[PDB]
Amino acid sequence: GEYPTVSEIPGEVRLYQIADGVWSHIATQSFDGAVYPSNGLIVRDGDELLLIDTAWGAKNTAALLAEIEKQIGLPVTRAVSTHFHDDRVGGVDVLRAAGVATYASPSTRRLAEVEGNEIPTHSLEGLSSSGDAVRFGPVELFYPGAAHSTDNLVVYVPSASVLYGGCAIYELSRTSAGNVADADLAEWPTSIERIQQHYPEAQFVIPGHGLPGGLDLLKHTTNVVKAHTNRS
Numbered sequence: 001g002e003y004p005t006v007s008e009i010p011g012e013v014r015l016y017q018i019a020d021g022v023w024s025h026i027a028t029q030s031f032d033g034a035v036y037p038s039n040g041l042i043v044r045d046g047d048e049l050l051l052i053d054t055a056w057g058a059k060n061t062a063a064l065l066a067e068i069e070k071q072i073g074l075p076v077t078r079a080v081s082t083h084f085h086d087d088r089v090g091g092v093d094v095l096r097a098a099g100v101a102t103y104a105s106p107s108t109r110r111l112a113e114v115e116g117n118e119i120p121t122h123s124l125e126g127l128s129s130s131g132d133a134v135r136f137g138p139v140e141l142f143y144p145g146a147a148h149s150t151d152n153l154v155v156y157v158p159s160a161s162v163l164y165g166g167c168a169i170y171e172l173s174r175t176s177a178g179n180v181a182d183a184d185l186a187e188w189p190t191s192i193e194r195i196q197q198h199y200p201e202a203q204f205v206i207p208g209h210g211l212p213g214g215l216d217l218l219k220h221t222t223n224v225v226k227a228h229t230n231r232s
């Protein structure tokens with residue numbers, strides 16, 4: 001029903017069922033005096049679970065595993081980090097200690113290493129060129145090109161028409177650019193156009209942060225990125 005917001009979430013994680021065998025995970029971090037939520041994805045893979053992204057640090061990620069263990073009761077066997085920043089790889093060591101196989105593209109592993117971030121163990125091949133797609137159990141992984149980061153992936157759940165954009169897609173309430181230090185502002189709209197052209201059938205679109213919507217989130221993101229590009 002109601003999507004969890006910061007008001008409903010203290011170190012804690014809430015799960016939200018989007019569709020059959022598909023959940024978002026919602027966590028929060030305090031940064032620079034503000035509290036910001038973050039979304040990831042949980043996709044049932046027969047009798048196991050695939051996790052998309054950490055819950056933004058070690059404590060949140062241990063809370064995530066505890067909240068999955070309580071509310072779903074199926075083992076997380078694999079996790080994918082959609083880019084090298086801490087809201088995506090922070091907590092990878094926690095997952096690994098729990099016997100989760102952690103995965104990222106070689107691009108993400110290299111950038112995580114340069115940044116001194118946690119490094120997922122396993123390499124995702126076949127994603128190095130813009131518009132590359134690879135199947136990963138119950139999802140398709142898609143490299144749309146540089147956007148929020150040079151390595152960002154998006155995740156589609158063909159069975160449920162759920163598109164998880166991670167930090168490449170903004171929620172409607174975000175009307176100004178977020179962390180764009182590692183962004184390719186010049187390529188971001190082209191990368192969104194690749195997502196639009198590949199998943200024109202998506203019914204649910206989950207941004208990296210805040211409320212889900214539909215494919216209008218992609219145009220929304222294009223509008224915000226263009227407005228930032230044109231700052232005088």
Ligand SMILES: N=C(N)NNC(=O)Nc1c(F)cc(S(=O)(=O)Nc2scnc2C(=O)O)cc1F
Pocket residue numbers: 031036087148167177178179180181208209
């Ligand atoms: N906007 C520039 N140029 N660079 N920004 C920064 O160096 N730092 C920074 C920033 F500007 C903005 C944010 S943010 O607004 O909280 N965005 C965040 S926090 C976790 N994920 C994101 C995101 O946008 O996906 C976090 C940051 F660490």
Ligand SMILES: [Zn+2]
Pocket residue numbers: 083085148149167179
């Ligand atoms: Zn990021």
Ligand SMILES: [Zn+2]
Pocket residue numbers: 101102121122
């Ligand atoms: Zn392994």
Ligand SMILES: [Zn+2]
Pocket residue numbers: 087167208209
């Ligand atoms: Zn982010």
